[PDB]
Amino acid sequence: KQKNRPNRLIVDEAINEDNSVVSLSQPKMDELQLFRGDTVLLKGKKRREAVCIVLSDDACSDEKIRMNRVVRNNLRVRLGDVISIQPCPDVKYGKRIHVLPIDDTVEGITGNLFEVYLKPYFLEAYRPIRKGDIFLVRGGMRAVEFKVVETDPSPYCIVAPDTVIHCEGEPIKREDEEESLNEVGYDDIGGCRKQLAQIKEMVELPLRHPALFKAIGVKPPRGILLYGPPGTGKTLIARAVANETGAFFFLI
Amino acid sequence: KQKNRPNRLIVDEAINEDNSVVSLSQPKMDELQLFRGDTVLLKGKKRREAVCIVLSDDACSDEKIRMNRVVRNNLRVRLGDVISIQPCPDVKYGKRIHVLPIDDTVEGITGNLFEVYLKPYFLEAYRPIRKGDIFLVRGGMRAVEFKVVETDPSPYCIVAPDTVIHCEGEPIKREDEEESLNEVGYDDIGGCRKQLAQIKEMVELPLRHPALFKAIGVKPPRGILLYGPPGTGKTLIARAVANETGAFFFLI
Ligand SMILES: Nc1ncnc2c1ncn2[C@@H]1O[C@H](COP(=O)(O)OP(=O)(O)O)[C@@H](O)[C@H]1O
Ligand SMILES: Nc1ncnc2c1ncn2[C@@H]1O[C@H](COP(=O)(O)OP(=O)(O)O)[C@@H](O)[C@H]1O
């Protein structure tokens, strides 16, 4: 079976903000035999899957794939990891969905969540979904998460205008496996691109591949000193780096 | 029943010093069908009532009502609250009243309180009263409070020249519900208007509506630093703010 050359890419940062658009470059797209708007299927770590509409861009390489933080966290991968891509031409429109909120997120929210949040989200935008994911909607000076529990053409479909939604039930608990989305990441840092590039390349090898430094005698850098006027967000950059590499973070 | 548009106003600061004059603007006054000098009836928090002569002014909005600190404290409301207004054309002259002092206020006062204090107060000024209120008279380098206990056309009337007063009895105790009137308020701060406006708008939302900051993620200001030469009354301003919002005050 052929899997190495047509079906391998490397995750990196995103430029678009939609939680379903995955951006890649045109040579890979006519190599994969995929056109714009076609729903694609991604497999990552721990046999997790995701369905996403595709899009083309130019400011990419021929092995890099740009995905948003929600879809990336939905596959359990981190930046610099590899995934598998496939065409999925057998998705159908749904006829029944059931969604729940996360209790950690809904606090002091009064009224009904349906007509304020889930009504403008699935409005005039055909969005694909798979059972057991988590998506995020922003508004009312808050950001609320939602977990899909069921799907009528199980286990994945596309949201069509005539797809009823039964938003019935009580909040569900966040388990000890997925991480929160109110945490810090590289997307929550405006400006300062060159310095971010430097720090990212400076801690890439010791924190991503730790076993490599048992096979070579080479000393990686261990002392970093950030400086600048107060109010420039340095602890932010620290927590960001520490969260995106999955490393442990202690604060003195 | 119609109550929202003709019978709702918002309390604010006063410009006059009389304990019976309540000031409002001419559009609301000819909307309520009220003329000058007519006794008006106010209902506030905890089904408290008050009878007051009315007056017109121009430096107001069309939903703000200016009342003195005595009448405001008599309704249990604070600044920025809402009250109900009504016309009360069925007040009559009294024929017997009975008033007592507050023991916390009378200290070292010798002689009789009647002819020195209660004689010039109800002199050539028709003043309305209701049973169970508290009013304040100034003189002799002191300020003495008085509580009405009974009224002959019960439970409210107007003081006419031929209304006898039986100032008979012993001092009464201040209970644990009403606050004193020798405390600090915005009226006891001369000058410094712009800075007062700034500090009042800076602590309005967190201290008046605390539940609102469980429904939005927005950080209110928490650090304030007052400065100026010594002798400019800064702790005064602090106690003032803390008393007018009803907040707890700790002093280090
Ligand atoms: N470049 C930036 N991008 C995003 N937010 C920033 C940036 N610079 C400052 N801030 C914001 O202002 C504050 C500045 O960071 P700082 O007060 O030094 O860190 P912290 O209080 O989190 O230890 C943070 O709350 C952050 O939200
Ligand atoms: N603007 C003002 N309005 C009213 N009284 C003031 C003003 N400025 C100063 N004072 C008076 O002078 C004193 C100045 O305040 P201060 O001596 O700093 O506070 P305290 O002695 O109460 O700790 C107070 O007793 C106050 O009565």
Swiss-Prot record, chains A, B:
Name by which UniProt lists this protein: Transitional endoplasmic reticulum ATPase
Subunit structure: Homohexamer. Forms a ring-shaped particle of 12.5 nm diameter, that displays 6-fold radial symmetry. Part of a ternary complex containing STX5A, NSFL1C and VCP. NSFL1C forms a homotrimer that binds to one end of a VCP homohexamer. The complex binds to membranes enriched in phosphatidylethanolamine-containing lipids and promotes Golgi membrane fusion. Binds to a heterodimer of NPLOC4 and UFD1, binding to this heterodimer inhibits Golgi-membrane fusion. Interaction with VCIP135 leads to dissociation of the complex via ATP hydrolysis by VCP.
Outcome of swapping residue 109 to F: In IBMPFD1; uncertain significance
Coverage span on the entire protein: 18 to 269 of 806
Record organism: Homo sapiens
PTM sites of type Phosphoserine: 20
Disease: Inclusion body myopathy with early-onset Paget disease with or without frontotemporal dementia 1: An autosomal dominant disease characterized by disabling muscle weakness clinically resembling to limb girdle muscular dystrophy, osteolytic bone lesions consistent with Paget disease, and premature frontotemporal dementia. Clinical features show incomplete penetrance.
Record cross-link Glycyl lysine isopeptide (Lys-Gly) (interchain with G-Cter in SUMO2), residues: 1
Domain of life: Eukaryota
Outcome (variant: residue 36 to A): Minor effect on affinity for ATP and ADP
Gene coding for it: VCP
Outcome recorded upon mutating residue 69 to A: Strongly increased affinity for ATP. Strongly reduced affinity for ADP
Positions bound to ATP 1: 230-236
Domain notes: The PIM (PUB-interaction motif) motif mediates interaction with the PUB domain of RNF31.
Effect of mutating residue 181 to W: In IBMPFD1; increased ATPase activity; impaired autophagic function
Subcellular location: Cytoplasm, Cytosol; Endoplasmic reticulum; Nucleus; Cytoplasm, Stress granule
